[PDB]
Amino acid sequence: RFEVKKWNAVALWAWDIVVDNCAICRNHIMDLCIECQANQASATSEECTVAWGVCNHAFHFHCISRWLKTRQVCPLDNREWEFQKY
Amino acid sequence: EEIRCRKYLHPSSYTKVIHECQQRMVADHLQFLHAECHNIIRQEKKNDMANMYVLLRAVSTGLPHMIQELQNHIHDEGLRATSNLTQENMPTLFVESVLEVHGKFVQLINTVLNGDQHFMSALDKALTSVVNYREPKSVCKAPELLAKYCDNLLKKSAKGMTENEVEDRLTSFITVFKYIDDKDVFQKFYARMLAKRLIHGLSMSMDSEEAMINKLKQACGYEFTSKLHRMYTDMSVSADLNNKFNNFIKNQDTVIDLGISFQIYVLQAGAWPLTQAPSSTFAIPQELEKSVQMFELFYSQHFSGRKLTWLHYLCTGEVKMNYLGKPYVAMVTTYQMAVLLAFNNSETVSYKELQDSTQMNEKELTKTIKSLLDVKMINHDSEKEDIDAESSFSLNMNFSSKRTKFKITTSMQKDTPQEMEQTRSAVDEDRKMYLQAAIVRIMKARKVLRHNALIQEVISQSRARFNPSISMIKKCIEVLIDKQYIERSQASADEYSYV
Amino acid sequence: LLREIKNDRGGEDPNQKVIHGVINSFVHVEQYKKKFPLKFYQEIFESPFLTETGEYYKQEASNLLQESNCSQYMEKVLGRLKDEEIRCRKYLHPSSYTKVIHECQQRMVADHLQFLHAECHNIIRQEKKNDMANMYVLLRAVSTGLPHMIQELQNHIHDEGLRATSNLTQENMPTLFVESVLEVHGKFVQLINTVLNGDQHFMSALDKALTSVVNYREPKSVCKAPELLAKYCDNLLKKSAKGMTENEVE
Ligand SMILES: [Zn+2]
Ligand SMILES: [Zn+2]
Ligand SMILES: [Zn+2]
C-alpha cells in the first residue's frame, strides 16, 4: 500500500482552435450544442443559432449564453463579448 | 596668456589668441604628448592624465589617440582581471570583477578626466570586448556566466541574501549585462533557469523575479522579456486557477473526491521553454487518472479553446511508503511514482512488467530505476544492477531514511549539458530566422544590392541582439534559395535577385 | 518519347541526349517554315505531352493524397514541381518550359485547393513556419489560391492582437498596450518576411488586422486607443526617474 498524498503537476496549455467548431463544447458550429445533444429531436433543432461576436468568433447561442451566465469575456481572446449576428 | 589677453586686447580676439597659443605648443609637438599619453594612461598618473586631457581636448586630433590608449588600457585591465577565475564561484566572481573594473574606470573618467562622452564610450567599447572574451576555438562563456549569476542569487539559499542586497546587486548587474552582446543566448539561458526556479519553488520571492524581469525589460525592451513576463504571470495566476478548480470540484452535482491533492501549474505553450519532445507515452496511474480527467473537464469548461499537454517529467507528487514500515514520505516525480505504484502490486517486478504497465520508453524507465536504486529505495535481484531483458527488480524493505520527509528527486540542478546544446541550437535557429527576415526585407525593399553593403547592414541591424556570422548569413541565403525567395543577378554574382 | 519521359518520372534515368535530340528534331525540322515554326512541335508532341503529363499528375496527386498528410503533401508536391522543372529543361523546347509546369501546378495544387485551403487554418494558426512557406509558394502559383490564406492570416493576427492587448494592468496600460501591439507587429512582420516572402498582400492583412485590433471598441464605450497612445507619449517624454536616455526614447 502506497497512498499518494500530493500530485503537484505541470501542464502546458496551447490554443486548440479548429476550423468550423464551437470552442465551448468542442462541437461543430452547424451541429447542435453538447447541451442539446440530449432531446435531439424534441425541439425544432434550430434554436441553436450561430452567435457571432464583434471579434468574429462563432459559437452556439446556448454555449455562449451559458458562458456569459458566469464570465462576460469571449473564451478565445479574453475580450468582452458583443453579439453582432445570429 | 588668457589673463594677459583679457587685459591687453578686445573680447573678439580672446579665442584666436588662445587658439594660436595652443596650436604652437600642443599641436606642433603632438608627437611628444602622444608618446607619453600611453605611459601616463597605462600607469594611471592622475595629474598628468588630467593635464594631458585638458591640453589635447582643444586640439582637433588630440583626443582620439588618448581615447584609444585609455580603451586599450581598460581592455588589458579587464582581460587581466577576468583571466584566472576559480570555477567554484566563477559566475559571481566574473560579474563582480567586471563591476569593479567598470566602477574604477568610470570614477577615474568622472574625477580626473572631466568625464567625457568619448572616454566613457571608450570604456564601454573596451568592456564590451572584455566581457565577450571569445576564447580561441571556444564559445563565449559570458552569457552563461551571467545567467548562472542571476540564477544563483535569485534562488533560495541558506547562504544569506537580504532582499535589499539582491535588489542592489541586480541593479548593478545590468551595467554588465548591457555589454554582453549575446542576448539571445542569455535570454534562452535565463528562461531555462527561470522555468526551474518558478516550477520547483526555488525562487526566494516572486517580487524579486518580477523586479529582475522589469530590469531586463528596461535594458532591452518588451520583446526580450515578452516571454519571461508570461512565464512569471502563468505562475502568479496558478494559485487563483487552483482556487477556481477547487471551487469547481466543490460545486458539482455529486462528490468529486479527487482523493489526494492537486497543485496544477498550467503554463503557456509558446512562452515556456518546456516541451513534450522527450515523450515516452507515459501511462498515468489509476490514482491520478481521475484527477487528470477532472481537471481536463474543468479546463475544457472554464478555459475554452485550449488543449493541455501534460508534462510528466516536471510533475512532482508525494507518496507515502506505509507498506515498508513508513519512515517518511517521498517527494517523487510521477515517472518514478508510476513504477513505485507498480511495486505496490507485488514485491517483485520485471522490466517487461514496467514496460507493460507504465508504458514508458526504455531510457526513461532506466533513468527512473537508476534514480530509485541510487537512493536504494528498491533493490535488484540480479547481481548486475543495470537493466537487462528481464532484470527482476525487488523491494528493499531494509532501507529507512533518517528524516520524516525526504526528497528523492533531483531535477532543480545538474543543468543537463545536452539541454545546453539544445539551447544553443535554438539560439542559432532564432538567429537564422532573424537573419532571414532582415535579408528578405532588404532584398524586397531595394531589389538590387551587393554582398558588402548587405553584410554591413545586417551586422549593424542585428548587433542589438547578437553578433552575426557570415556563415549563418550564407546559410540563410541558401535556405531562401531552397524556399525560392531569393536568387543572384546574372550580370554579376555579387548582386542578388528576388522572386 | 512520352513513355520514356514517364519512365524518367518513375525514377529511372533514360538517355537524356537521345530523347532531347528526338524532341528537338520536331522543332528543328521546321526552321525554314518562318510562319509558325513551332506548330509542328506543338501539334505532334507538346499537346500529347501536355495531355499525358496532366493525366499523369492527376493520378500522382490522387496517389499522394491517399497516403500523406497536408504537411507532407505540399512538400511532396513541391518536390515534384522542382523535378518537373528540371526534367522539362533537359528534354523539351524552351517554349514548353512554362506550359508543362503550369500543367504540373494545375493538377496537384489547383485541383486540390479545397484540400489545401481547409488546412490554411491549422497551419497559420499554429505558426507552422515550414508548412506555411510550402503552402504559400504552392498557392502563389494558382490565381485564386492566396485570398483565403491571406484571410486566415488576418484572422490569426487579429486574434493574437486581441489576446495580447487584453486584461492589461491599469497601472501601466498606456505602455503595455503599445508594447503588446508592437510585439505582435514585430512577430507577424518577421513571420511574413521569412515565411511568406513579405508580400504586400500578407502585410496588408497584417495592417488590416492590427487596425481592427488597435481600434477595438469596448461594449457601449469609446475607443481608448487614442487616449492610451497620448498617455504613452506623455509618460515617455516627461522627465521620469527611470533612466530613459535620449537616444533610447528617440
Ligand atoms: Zn457549442
Ligand atoms: Zn443547444
Ligand atoms: Zn473572441
Numbering used by the authors:
A (entry chain E): 21 to 106
B (entry chain B): 246 to 744
C (entry chain A): 163 to 412
In the authors' words:
We recently discovered that FEM1B, a substrate receptor of Cullin 2-RING ligase (CRL2), recognizes C-degrons containing a C-terminal proline. By solving several cryo-EM structures of CRL2FEM1B bound to different C-degrons, we elucidate the dimeric assembly of the complex. Furthermore, we reveal distinct dimerization states of unmodified and neddylated CRL2FEM1B to uncover the NEDD8-mediated activation mechanism of CRL2FEM1B. Our research also indicates that, FEM1B utilizes a bipartite mechanism to recognize both the C-terminal proline and an upstream aromatic residue within the substrate.
Although most of the identified FEM1B C-degrons bearing substrates contain a proline at the C-terminus, some of them, including CUX1, do not end with a proline. To understand how the C-degron of CUX1 is recognized by FEM1B, we further solved the cryo-EM structure of unCRL2FEM1B with CUX1. The CRL2FEM1B-CUX1 dimera and dimers were solved at resolutions of 3.38 Å and 3.27 Å, respectively. The two dimeric structures of the unCRL2FEM1B-CUX1 complex are similar to those of the CRL2FEM1B-CCDC89 complex. Local refinement was performed on the dimera structure of unCRL2FEM1B-CUX1 to obtain a 3.60 Å resolution structure of the FEM1B-CUX1 subcomplex. Unlike dimers, dimera adopts a ring-like architecture, with the two CRL2 protomers binding to each other in an asymmetric manner. RBX1.p2 associates with the WHB domain of CUL2.p2, which characterizes an autoinhibitory state for unmodified CRL2.
